[PDB]
Symmetry: C2
Subunit: 335 residues, 2 copies
Amino acid sequence: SLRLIATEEAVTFQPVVDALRAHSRTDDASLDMILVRDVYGDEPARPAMIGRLSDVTGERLAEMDSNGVDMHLLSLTAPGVQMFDAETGTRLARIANDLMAQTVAANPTRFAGLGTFAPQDPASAAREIERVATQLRLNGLVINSHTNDLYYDDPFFHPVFEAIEASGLALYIHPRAPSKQIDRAFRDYGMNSAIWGYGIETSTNAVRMILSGLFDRFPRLKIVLGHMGEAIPFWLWRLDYMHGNATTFGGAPKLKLKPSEYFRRNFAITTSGVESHAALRYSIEVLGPENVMWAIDYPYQPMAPAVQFIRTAPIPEDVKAMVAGGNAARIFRIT
Amino acid sequence: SLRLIATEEAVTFQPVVDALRAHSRTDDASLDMILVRDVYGDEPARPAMIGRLSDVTGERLAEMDSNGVDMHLLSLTAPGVQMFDAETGTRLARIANDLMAQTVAANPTRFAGLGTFAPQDPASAAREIERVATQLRLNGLVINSHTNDLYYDDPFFHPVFEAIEASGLALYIHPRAPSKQIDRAFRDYGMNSAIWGYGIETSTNAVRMILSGLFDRFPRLKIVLGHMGEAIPFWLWRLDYMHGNATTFGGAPKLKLKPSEYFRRNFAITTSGVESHAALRYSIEVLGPENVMWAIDYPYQPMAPAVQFIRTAPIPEDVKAMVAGGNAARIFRIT
Ligand SMILES: [Mn+2]
Ligand SMILES: [Mn+2]
């Protein structure tokens, strides 16, 4: 009876897989090359991952059925098309988006989809964002933190955000590995990945977006952050408290709202990879129950424990319905 | 009659101030130079700060009295003596520690103190840690995240942690601005400081310490983190979950315990700069009430709101007493 819509569910498609296979052989210094080699490289350390990522109607659907999961909201897996040059990224984003729409239409009661884009070329990205919203009628958008080691405060990306805001599509900002601005401290102990780097990279991106005033410029933007908001919900009081010093002594711009007010107004979060009732309850309290969505983070996380996490959450049934799927249905235009 | 012991209370002394005024004029590229110029520069943007940091028995004690604060646990303010060359840092650490001991001894019912050291020279730091523990009988230790842009998983610092463990003194790892490994992303919107950079720098340091197996090598270390544990308490589930991948594919060493188990066994946290009852409640729930301590972060934060934050906390009186001062009395050897 509980409607479950998992909102951070990765997929890939052959043309992107082939491109990453070739890219894995190059001398790119980006920290994502660790993942890219492990999954897409010759002699990969994780040889089953491409199969599990590519599968939609086999193991994925059987697991959804076994666990009573109604839908996956699908996204091209990190690092998407962002590691390629502008020309290649742009070509592949179109291809990946068409394949995403095709995948969704084969089973639209079970799958919804986010389109992606190649912000290496902001004008072409804005055009693809319009095409995703209007021509393909996809459910929203996904991008994997930084592009070209720049964050989304940079005015270079204004045409992208202008297009996103006009489109009405929410943007899921998924992690990728720490950019070159920060990667040096994430080369050890597997910290390049989900264990630490992903969170630091993505949250820092989001915080720069807020403090730069991007949400005064584009106030109707809706951003979604996985991994219980990449911990930003935990830092809200300190973000607010220290903002006066930042504008006064630090040369940060004056904002109309407080940092945490942008977070509640313009962001929503998902529970991907943070199956903690305590953290879920914290987030509901400080963000409000309309701002928290459930996710699995399949195939990197197994479905069963993610499902049982939300089914057993110590919150009222109406709030649980919102988190399990009601909020996603609203935010990602799912019927 | 609630005993209030504030655990992250900054102070400075003339010999360190003079050293930092001189350092302010050098071409050090450290991100801390923004703070150092602002407070200690020839043309300071924050001219009253040196006076406020230096004052112990004037305005500080008066504010403590007005607000019913029993004690401050004093620490040489960031960046301590860690920006100097090895010889200079070593010399000033001894001098700062002697002055701290004398300051505590002058009003020992109102002030406790943490000694510091210069990790630039691990062998010399080890000796000063022993002196601090055995001869000055100070209450514990303080260091400001990185030294020379290295983190405390580095085996270079092993003689330091060997000494700390043996001394039985708890080490407060206070923030510093992001090291050169990560500072590129923290040059804008005032993010070098408390609003964002501090927490990312310090939490990353601690996470590296945990994942490197430092607490299998030194299982009796006690580390204290301010700012509600630099958000580490929020990330515990994901740290644990992803640790399997880190060791299997990421070359992280195999640990005896889970990451969150080191966090609970070897760390305690304080509420400095995070006056959120919701964040406080979360922390007590996931760490246990014995691992959370109150702090003010004076003079960077005012006393009254921090005091009223704990006096009004929606927790039982016995738990409130532990947080307000009881835990600190145990952890920092205060009668
Ligand atoms: Mn994911
Ligand atoms: Mn402090």
